C-alpha cells in the first residue's frame, strides 16, 4: 500500500500519514495517526512537536488586501513527538509500527484523537476575484521544530498538511419525508390542502430528487403557480452566529389549480454546482487546495450549538395563490410546505477521494 509524506523546506522534518480524510462516525472519529522523520543532520532545535488544528479561515470585510486571510482556532491539540515524553507511554497503531519499521529509529509517532461534536471540513464558495486560501472550516497537521511552545515557529523548520474530517450517508434510510398543510381562508368555508413527499430521505450528490405534489383546492381562490426549490440551510456558529437559506435548485411550474378541483404532479430537481457558481458563501465540502468540491454534504449530529458550519437541506413546495376579494391584495394567501432531507456521499466501499 501507499502513504502520504511531506517535507519541510529545509528537509529537516518529514511528516508521514496514512490518509488525508478521516471519517467521523458520530460516536467516534478516525484517529489521526502518523510519524515524523527527523533528519539528525539538520536538527539542532532539540524538540519536535506535532499539532492538530481545526480552524475557521476567513477574510476581513473591511480590509482591501488581496489574498489576505486569517485562521481562528476552534480546536487545538499538541503532541511532543521528539523527544518521547517521559510520562506518556502509549501503544502504537499498526500503521505507525509499519512506518517505524520502514523509516527507522528517527521516525517518531504522533496520534491525535478527534473528539465528537467538532465541525466537519466545509469550504465556503469564493467569488470570482478571490486569490487567498479557501475560507471556511478546515483541519491541519503541523509538525515543527522549537525549544518550547512559546517559540516563534520558523516556517522552514516546519511542515503543514491539510486534512479533512468527513461523514458519509447512513446505511439505513430514514422515513420517507412527507409533509402536509391545510389553509382555511376568510371568505371560504372549504380549505386548501397541500400534500408533498420526496421519493426517499437520503440522496447522493448529483442524484435526482422527486417531489410528489398533491393539491386539493376546495376554495374559491386559484393556484396561479407552483414553485419547487431545493434550499441549503447553513448554520454558522463561531464568533457570533449567522444563518442563511440558499436555493441550490428550483423550478417554477405554471401549473394551475382551478377552484373546486385537484391537482397531482411529480417534479424532479437535481442540485449541482455548475449553475450556482455566482453564489459566494455557498457551503461546499472541504477543499484540500482550490480543487472543485460538491455542494456541502448534510451534517450528521448526535442525540447543543456546534462551532463551524452545519449544513442541512430542505425542499420547499410553494403554492402561489390569487388574492383579491374582501381584503384585496393586502392579505397573502400563499401556501407552502417543507421537506428536510439528507444529501451525502455513499460510504466508500473501496478508497477515499
Amino acid at each position: 500500500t501507499r502513504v502520504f509524506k511531506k517535507a519541510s523546506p529545509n528537509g529537516k522534518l518529514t511528516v508521514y500519514l496514512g490518509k488525508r480524510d478521516f471519517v467521523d462516525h458520530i460516536d467516534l472519529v478516525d484517529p489521526v495517526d502518523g510519524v515524523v522523520l527527523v533528519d539528525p543532520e539538520y536538527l539542532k532545535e532539540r524538540r519536535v512537536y506535532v499539532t492538530l488544528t481545526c480552524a475557521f479561515r476567513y477574510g476581513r470585510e473591511d480590509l482591501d488586501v488581496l489574498g489576505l486571510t486569517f485562521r481562528k482556532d476552534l480546536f487545538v491539540a499538541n503532541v511532543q513527538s521528539f523527544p518521547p515524553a517521559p510520562e506518556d507511554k502509549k501503544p502504537l497503531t499498526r500503521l505507525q509500527e509499519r512506518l517505524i519499521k520502514k523509516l527507522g529509529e528517527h521516525a517518531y509517532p504522533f496520534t491525535f484523537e478527534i473528539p465528537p461534536n467538532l465541525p466537519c471540513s466545509v469550504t465556503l464558495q469564493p467569488g470570482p476575484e478571490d486569490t487567498g486560501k479557501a475560507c471556511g472550516v478546515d483541519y491541519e497537521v503541523k509538525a515543527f521544530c522549537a525549544e518550547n511552545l512559546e517559540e516563534k515557529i520558523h516556517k522552514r523548520n516546519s511542515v503543514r498538511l491539510v486534512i479533512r474530517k468527513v461523514q458519509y450517508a447512513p446505511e439505513r434510510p430514514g422515513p420517507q419525508p412527507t409533509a402536509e398543510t391545510t389553509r382555511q381562508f376568510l371568505m371560504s368555508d372549504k380549505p386548501l390542502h397541500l400534500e408533498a413527499s420526496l421519493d426517499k430521505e437520503i440522496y447522493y450528490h448529483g442524484e435526482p430528487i422527486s417531489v410528489n405534489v398533491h393539491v386539493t383546492n376546495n376554495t374559491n381562490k386559484t393556484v396561479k403557480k407552483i414553485k419547487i426549490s431545493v434550499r441549503q440551510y447553513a448554520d454558522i456558529c463561531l464568533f457570533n452566529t449567522a444563518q442563511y437559506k440558499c436555493p441550490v435548485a428550483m423550478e417554477e411550474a405554471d401549473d394551475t389549480v382551478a377552484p373546486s378541483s385537484t391537482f397531482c404532479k411529480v417534479y424532479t430537481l437535481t442540485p449541482f454546482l455548475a449553475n450556482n457558481r455566482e453564489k459566494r458563501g455557498l457551503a461546499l465540502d472541504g477543499k484540500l487546495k482550490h480543487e472543485d468540491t460538491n455542494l456541502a454534504s448534510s451534517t450528521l449530529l448526535r442525540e447543543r450549538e456546534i462551532l463551524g458550519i452545519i449544513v442541512s437541506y430542505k425542499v420547499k413546495v410553494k403554492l402561489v395563490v390569487s388574492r383579491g376579494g374582501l381584503l384585496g391584495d393586502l392579505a397573502s394567501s400563499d401556501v407552502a410546505v417543507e421537506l428536510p432531507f439528507t444529501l451525502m456521499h455513499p460510504k466508500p466501499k473501496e478508497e477515499p477521494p
Binding site: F4, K5, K6, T69, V159
Partner: peptide, 21 residues
C-alpha cells in the same frame, strides 16, 4: 493578534511506498 496569511511556497505533497505485513 489573529494569525494572518497571504495565499497565492511549500513543497508539493509526496507519496511513498509501504510494505505489507
Amino acid at each position: 493578534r489573529t494569525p494572518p496569511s497571504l495565499g497565492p511556497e511549500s513543497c508539493t505533497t509526496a507519496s511513498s511506498s509501504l510494505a505489507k505485513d
